[PDB]
Amino acid sequence: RHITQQHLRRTAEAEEQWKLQAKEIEAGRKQSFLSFLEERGLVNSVVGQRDALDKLITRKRVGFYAGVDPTAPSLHIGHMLPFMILGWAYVHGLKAVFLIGGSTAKIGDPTGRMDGATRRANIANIHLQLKRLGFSFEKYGRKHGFEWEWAWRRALENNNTWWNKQSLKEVMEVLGTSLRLGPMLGRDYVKSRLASGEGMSIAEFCYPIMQGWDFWYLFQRKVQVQVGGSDQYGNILFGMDAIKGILKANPESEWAPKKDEDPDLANPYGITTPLLTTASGEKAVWLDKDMTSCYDLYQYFVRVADSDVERYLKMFTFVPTPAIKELMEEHAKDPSKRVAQHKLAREFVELIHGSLSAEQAAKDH
Amino acid sequence: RHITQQHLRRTAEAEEQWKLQAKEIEAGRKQSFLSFLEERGLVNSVVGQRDALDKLITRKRVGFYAGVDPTAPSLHIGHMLPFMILGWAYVHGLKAVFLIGGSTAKIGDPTGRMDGATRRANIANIHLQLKRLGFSFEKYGRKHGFEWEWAWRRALENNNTWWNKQSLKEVMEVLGTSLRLGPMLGRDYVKSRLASGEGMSIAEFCYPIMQGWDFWYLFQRKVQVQVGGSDQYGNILFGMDAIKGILKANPESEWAPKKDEDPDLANPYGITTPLLTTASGEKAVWLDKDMTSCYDLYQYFVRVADSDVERYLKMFTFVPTPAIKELMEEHAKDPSKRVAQHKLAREFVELIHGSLSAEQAAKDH
Numbered sequence: 071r072h073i074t075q076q077h078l079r080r081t082a083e084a085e086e087q088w089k090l091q092a093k094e095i096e097a098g099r100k101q102s103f104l105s106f107l108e109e110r111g112l113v114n115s116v117v118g119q120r121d122a123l124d125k126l127i128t129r130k131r132v133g134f135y136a137g138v139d140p141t142a143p144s145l146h147i148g149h150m151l152p153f154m155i156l157g158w159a160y161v162h163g164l165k166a167v168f169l170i171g172g173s174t175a176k177i178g179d180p181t182g183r184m185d186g187a188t189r190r191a192n193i194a195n196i197h198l199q200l201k202r203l204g205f206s207f208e209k210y211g212r213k214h215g216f217e218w219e220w221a222w223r224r225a226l227e228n229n230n231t232w233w234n235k236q237s238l239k240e241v242m243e244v245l246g247t248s249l250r251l252g253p254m255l256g257r258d259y260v261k262s263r264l265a266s267g268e269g270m271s272i273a274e275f276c277y278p279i280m281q282g283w284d285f286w287y288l289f290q291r292k293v294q295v296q297v298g299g300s301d302q303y304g305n306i307l308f309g310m311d312a313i314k315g316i317l318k319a320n321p322e323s324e325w326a327p328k329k330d331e332d333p334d335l336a337n338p339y340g341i342t343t344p345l346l347t348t349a350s351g352e353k354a355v356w357l358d359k360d361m362t363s364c365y366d367l368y369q370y371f372v373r374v375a376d377s378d379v380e381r382y383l384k385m386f387t388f389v390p391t392p393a394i395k396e397l398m399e400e401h402a403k404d405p406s407k408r409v410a411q412h413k414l415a416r417e418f419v420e421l422i423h424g425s426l427s428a429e430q431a432a433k434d435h
Numbered sequence: 436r437h438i439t440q441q442h443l444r445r446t447a448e449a450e451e452q453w454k455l456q457a458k459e460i461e462a463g464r465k466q467s468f469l470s471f472l473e474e475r476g477l478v479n480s481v482v483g484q485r486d487a488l489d490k491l492i493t494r495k496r497v498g499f500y501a502g503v504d505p506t507a508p509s510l511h512i513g514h515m516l517p518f519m520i521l522g523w524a525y526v527h528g529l530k531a532v533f534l535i536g537g538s539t540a541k542i543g544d545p546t547g548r549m550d551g552a553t554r555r556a557n558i559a560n561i562h563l564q565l566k567r568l569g570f571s572f573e574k575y576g577r578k579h580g581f582e583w584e585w586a587w588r589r590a591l592e593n594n595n596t597w598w599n600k601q602s603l604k605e606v607m608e609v610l611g612t613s614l615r616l617g618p619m620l621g622r623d624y625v626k627s628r629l630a631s632g633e634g635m636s637i638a639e640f641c642y643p644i645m646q647g648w649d650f651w652y653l654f655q656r657k658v659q660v661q662v663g664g665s666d667q668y669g670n671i672l673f674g675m676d677a678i679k680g681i682l683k684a685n686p687e688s689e690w691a692p693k694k695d696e697d698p699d700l701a702n703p704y705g706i707t708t709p710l711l712t713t714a715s716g717e718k719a720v721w722l723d724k725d726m727t728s729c730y731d732l733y734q735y736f737v738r739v740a741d742s743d744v745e746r747y748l749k750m751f752t753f754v755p756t757p758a759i760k761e762l763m764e765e766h767a768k769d770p771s772k773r774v775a776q777h778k779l780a781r782e783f784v785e786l787i788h789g790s791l792s793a794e795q796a797a798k799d800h
C-alpha cells in the first residue's frame with residue numbers, strides 16, 4: 071500500500087546521491103568509474119564509444135551483467151575478471167547481475183571453436199559458487215572498504231528463467247526481422263567452419279541471437295552494460311547492434327530515446343577484460359575447494375612473475391592503488407621474499423574461500 | 436468413462452475396413468489413391484519415393500494437410516488444386532487438414548521472391564472461406580458421390596494456435612541441432628538474395644524452419660503427407676528431411692520406426708500439384724463473391740481453351756473419369772457449343788458458392 075511510497079522516496083534519494091556524485095566527477099573532483107576500471111587494468115576494450123559509456127555511468131545508476139556457460143564443473147580464475155568488474159560495480163552502488171547460461175550451455179558458444187546429467191551438476195555447483203561469491207564481494211568489499219547502502223543491487227540469474235517459456239514468435243518478430251543474414255554469415259567462426267566443411271547446426275548459428283536476447287531481456291530491466299572476456303567482444307557488439315536494431319525499428323518503444331533525450335543515455339554498451347595466460351595459453355586453477363584446495367590456489371598465486379605482480383594485484387584485489395604503489399617499493403627492497411605475491415595470494419584466497427581459510431593457507435605457505 | 440470403449444471399437448472397425456480395402460488394392464482389384472490422384476492430373480510430383488507413398492496410403496489411414504499464408508484478402512482458384520487433393524482425401528476416409536498460416540504470414544514465404552490490420556481481415560475472410568469449403572466438400576462429395584462415414588476426418592487449423600506459445604528452446608534443441616547451416620544456405624532464393632545484395636532478415640531465413648515445425652507438429656498428430664503447389668516443393672522436402680532428422684536423432688522417439696517396423700510407414704511424404712496459368716503467368720479469379728461474382732467466376736471457366744478442358748475437368752471437379760470420357764466425345768460433336776466448358780463451370784461454381792448460386796449463374800450465361 072504505502073510501501074510503494076517509502077520505496078519511491080528511497081529511490082529519489084539515491085538519484086540525488088548519484089546527481090551530486092555526478093557533479094563531483096564531471097567537474098573533476100572525483101574519478102569516474104570507467105577511468106577507475108581502466109587504472110586497474112580490467113578494461114581490455116570498450117564496445118561502443120568509450121567517452122559515451124563514461125558519460126552514461128557517471129550520469130546514470132546503470133546495471134552491469136556477465137554470463138558464464140556451465141560447461142565446466144567449477145569456475146576457474148579465468149572467469150574472474152568480468153566478475154571483478156561486477157564486484158567493483160556492485161560496491162560502487164551500480165547494479166550487478168551474474169548470469170548462468172542454463173540454456174545457452176546446452177548449445178555451446180561457437181566462439182572461438184557433453185551430456186545433460188553432467189551439465190545439471192555443473193549448473194548447481196557454479197550456481198552455489200556465484201551465490202557465495204556475491205556475499206563474498208559484500209564482505210570483502212565492506213573491509214577495504216565500501217559502506218553498504220540501500221541502493222546497492224545484486225542479482226544472480228539463470229537465463230532459462232525466460233528460455234523455458236520464451237516464444238520463438240516474439241523473438242522472430244521483435245528481433246529476427248531486424249537482424250540481417252549477410253552480416254551474421256560474415257562472423258569469423260561462421261566463415262571458418264563453413265570453409266572447413268565442418269559446418270554448423272542452426273542451433274549453433276543462432277547462439278549469438280540467444281545471447282543478444284538475454285542482453286535485451288536484461289536491458290528492459292535497467293541493465294545497460296554487458297561485461298565479458300576479450301573473446302566475447304563479437305558476441306557483445308552483436309548484442310548492442312541487436313538492441314539498437316530493436317529500438318531503431320520500434321521508436322515508440324518504452325525504451326527508445328524519443329527526442330529531446332540524449333541517445334547516449336539510452337543505448338547499450340560493452341566492456342571486455344584482458345585474457346589471462348599461464349605463460350603460454352589461456353586458462354587451469356579451479357575455485358572448487360575439492361578440485362583446488364586453498365593451499366593449491368594460494369600456491370598458484372605465490373609463484374606469479376615479479377614482472378606481472380603489479381597488474382595482477384590491480385586486477386585481482388580490492389586493495390587501493392596507492393597501497394599497491396607503496397607495497398611495490400617495499401617489495402622492490404627484497405624481491406627474494408615474495409612481498410607482493412603473498413599479499414596478492416592472501417587477498418584473493420580470502421575473496422574466494424573466506425578469511426579463515428585464507429589465513430590458514432597463508433600461515434601454511 | 437465407457438465412451439473411450441465405444442470410440443476404440445469404432446476405430447478398430449475403421450482399421451478393419453482399411454485392411455480389407457488394402458487387400459483389394461494391393462491384389463489389383465481396386466485402384467490406389469495415389470494412382471487416382473495421378474489420373475486426375477493433380478500430382479505434379481511426389482516428394483519422397485512415389486511407390487513408398489502409394490504403399491503408405493494403401494496400408495494406412497494417414498492424414499494430409501495444405502497451408503495457405505493469408506497474404507491475400509481472399510482465396511483464388513490458384514490455391515484450389517492442393518485443396519482438391521485434400522477434398523478427395525477427405526471423401527476417401529483419409530484425414531484432411533486445412534492450415535492457415537497465421538504466424539508464417541507475418542514473415543512472408545521468401546519463395547520465390549503489408550500491415551497487421553489488413554492481415555487480420557485476410558485471416559478472418561480466408562478462415563470463413565475454408566470453414567465453408569469443408570462443408571462444401573462434404574455436400575459436393577456426397578452427391579457424386581461418397582457415403583459419409585464416421586471415420587471421415589476434417590480439420591481447419593491456424594498455425595499460431597501453437598506459435599502463440601511454442602518455445603524457441605524446444606525448437607532449437609529438438610530441430611535446430613539437427614539442421615545444418617550449409618545446406619540451407621544452398622537454397623535457391625538464399626543464394627539469389629545474398630548475391631544481389633538485397634539480402635534477408637533472420638526471420639525470412641527461418642521461414643522454412645517454422646513451416647517444417649508446422650509439419651512436425653501435425654506429424655505427431657497422424658498427418659504424414661504435406662500437399663502444396665509446385666513452388667512449395669523445396670519447403671516440403673525441407674520439412675520431410677527435418678522430421679526425419681528428428682527421428683534419426685531421437686530413435687527412441689514415440690514416432691521413430693523401431694525395428695522390426697517398416698520405415699516407409701513411419702516417414703513423411705509430400706505431394707506437389709501443377710501450376711495454373713492465364714496463358715502467360717501464374718494466378719486472378721477470387722472466391723469471395725464480393726470480388727468475383729458468381730457470374731464472373733462462371734464466365735472465367737466458360738472461356739477455357741478447348742485444348743485444356745479435359746485436364747481442367749479432371750482437376751477441378753469430382754465428376755467420374757468415364758463421365759468425362761463420354762462428355763468429351765459428346766463435346767467433340769459440336770465444340771461450337773461449349774458442352775464441356777459449361778459442365779466444368781457449373782460444377783466448380785457449385786463446389787464454391789452453392790448449388791442455387793451455381794444454377795443461377797448457369798441459367799444467366
Ligand SMILES: N[C@@H](Cc1ccc(O)cc1)C(=O)O
Pocket residue numbers: 136137138139169170171174179229280281282284285302305
Ligand atoms: N558466451 C559466454 C556465456 C554467456 C551466456 C549467456 C550470455 O547472455 C552471455 C554470456 C561464454 O561462453 O563464456
Ligand SMILES: N[C@@H](Cc1ccc(O)cc1)C(=O)O
Pocket residue numbers: 501502503504534535536539544594645646647649650667670
Ligand atoms: N508456404 C505457403 C503457406 C504455408 C504456411 C504454413 C505451412 O505449414 C505450409 C504452407 C504459401 O506461401 O502459400
